Design a protein around this ligand. Structure first.
Ligand SMILES: [Mg+2]
Lengths: 349, 347
């Protein structure tokens, strides 16, 4: 049974899980430039509607990572974290994960994010950072220095995943969310072993938790029960607590921590300059549902970070994560870290 | 307002499309405005969602609107098609091609529709070319072929030029999709009757729905062993279509004295298919002949359903008689010879 597109696509459209190595073969065809756009699209859609398994996604992400540019050896702290969403919920939110990232870094946890400029005028993470004066497109050496000197870094996806460009193009062409939406968080080229990961779909969030569990990562995979790939105060959330290769599925109610119920339109995004203004507001200590969501996201990442070296009780872990996140803001540390981050970028010249 | 993200999104959510959306998608594909990735995504998503009769009807309809028709009043009102949708894991071109010749030799006008296969494994057109038949004829010559020989063949790339972008994507992915269903439903001669085989029972029912809305007289057939023809291996399900209604029934050729056969006995290669044609039309008995006679009769029963009031059972007995006779009296062999001779005398 030598792999082929008819064999693999046939299996998927028959609603069957793939044999071992088939997903990996598919990805190696995609990453070497040998997959036609039609084959990429067909595979992406087929994989999605069949329902991908943890093993299948692990093969995809593993092959993708092998093609990626690494950060220099021994430069990424062992306890570095990611804060990121898979997108594909159809809800344009303000850049909560990016704000949370700055807060988490300010609380003493190394953060390395990973992404690209958004195709549409809707400002994504990378676009907002650039609007804030951050240099997002840096080589491996400079990201390493950024992590060392500032405590935070950003891996620009096109630079670190150049062989993924064919796949990325197809993604834009078809528009619909697919299995490939899961690969972003699973192919952070800095390879953090912890993070707060948002996912737009309940079924896929569990698949992701399985992949992270297989890597023995310490992660919280979060799903807004209203369908958001974000952690917010608008409603309750399902959180998969991944640590020690073990996975606990928990419900999470922000009201239990005293947060008020916010409306979803209060978290709506805009253009880059608007989202930049929102970042400055939160880091400036402004109260409201945005800060609340940022503090939740930051605390989540901090709980995941703690999961690397211990396994504390859930609620007291969160209470301390929330405190550290709140402190990081109100001491001015988070605002100060963004400034040091901007400063580091200016020093490069 | 329709868009690919909207339509693809609806399909991936396992939802039927709104009326007109399938048509929009197909029009984009046929006008060269669809990207290969979008074509592929749509094909695969529609397949795994499971298309409805309304959806396939829009796809077939749009495709036909871009097709070259045959000249006015050159297709007999009672012309038939004989074909399967393939995408079965096996192949069936041998039977459909042979049955079509037998049907034409029984006195029923036949107009088939197909293309050359990329693989060495024959498509409908490849076997005919191996027998000396000239497959790539324009509308005028196909019409004269129908008039003078009693049979004709519409070469898809010539009658469906706008379909080329879809065809290319189809080859690249290889896997069967909803597009496999379109062949029988986009015959540019637009025959009103026929014997249509389908590899999957759920899709056979859908095809039957589309034909019903056309007021065609068609037998949509599915071998319960998975064959996209009437099989002798076991029973078949037939969606009997006429006057806008569908009569679904279990069919057993044993009731007509056919011995049970093995699947392997019904093969293949283009050159090997041609040898099978020669053998059968020459009078060789066996499972292959039986399957040909059975499906030929089926097309004749469908043909009768147009303007004859003959009931199912006697129509089949007559159909079987005419099919066997068309072979045993050499009429089928003689018709193939006349078909080849027709093509030779042009250039
Ligand atoms: Mg989001």
């Amino acid at each position: 049974s030598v792999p082929s597109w008819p064999q693999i696509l046939g299996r998927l459209t028959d609603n069957r899980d793939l044999a071992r190595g088939q997903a990996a073969w598919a990805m190696d065809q995609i990453m070497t430039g040998n997959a036609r756009p039609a084959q990429i699209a067909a595979f992406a859609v087929a994989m999605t509607m069949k329902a991908p398994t943890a093993d299948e996604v692990g093969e995809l992400a593993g092959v993708m990572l092998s093609h990626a540019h690494p950060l220099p050896a021994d430069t990424v702290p062992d306890d570095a974290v990611d804060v990121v969403g898979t997108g594909g919920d159809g809800v344009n939110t303000v850049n909560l994960s990016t704000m949370a990232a700055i807060v988490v870094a300010a609380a003493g946890v190394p953060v390395v994010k990973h992404g690209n400029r958004a195709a549409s005028s809707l400002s994504g993470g990378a676009d907002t950072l650039e609007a804030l004066g951050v240099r997002i497109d840096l080589g491996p050496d400079l990201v390493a220095r950024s992590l060392a000197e500032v405590g935070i870094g950003f891996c620009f996806a096109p630079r670190f995943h150049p062989s993924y460009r064919h796949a990325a193009a197809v993604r834009r062409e078809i528009g619909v969310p697919t299995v490939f939406n899961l690969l972003g968080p699973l192919t952070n080229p800095a390879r953090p072993r912890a993070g707060l990961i948002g996912c737009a779909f309940a079924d896929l969030a569990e698949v992701m938790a399985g992949v992270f569990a297989a890597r023995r990562s310490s992660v919280l995979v979060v799903h807004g029960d209203d369908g958001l790939d974000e952690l917010t105060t608008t409603t309750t959330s399902t959180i998969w607590r991944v640590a020690a290769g073990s996975v606990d599925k928990l419900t999470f109610d922000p009201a239990g921590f005293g947060f008020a119920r916010a409306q979803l339109d209060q978290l709506a995004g805009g253009d880059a300059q608007a989202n930049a203004a929102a970042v400055r507001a939160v880091l400036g200590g402004a109260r409201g549902p945005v800060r609340d969501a940022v503090v939740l996201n930051a605390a989540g990442a901090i709980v995941a970070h703690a999961g690397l070296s211990s396994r504390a009780e859930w609620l007291p872990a969160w209470e301390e994560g929330l405190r550290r996140a709140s402190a990081a803001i109100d001491t001015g540390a988070a605002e100060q870290l963004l400034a040091r981050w901007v400063r580091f970028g200016r020093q490069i010249l």
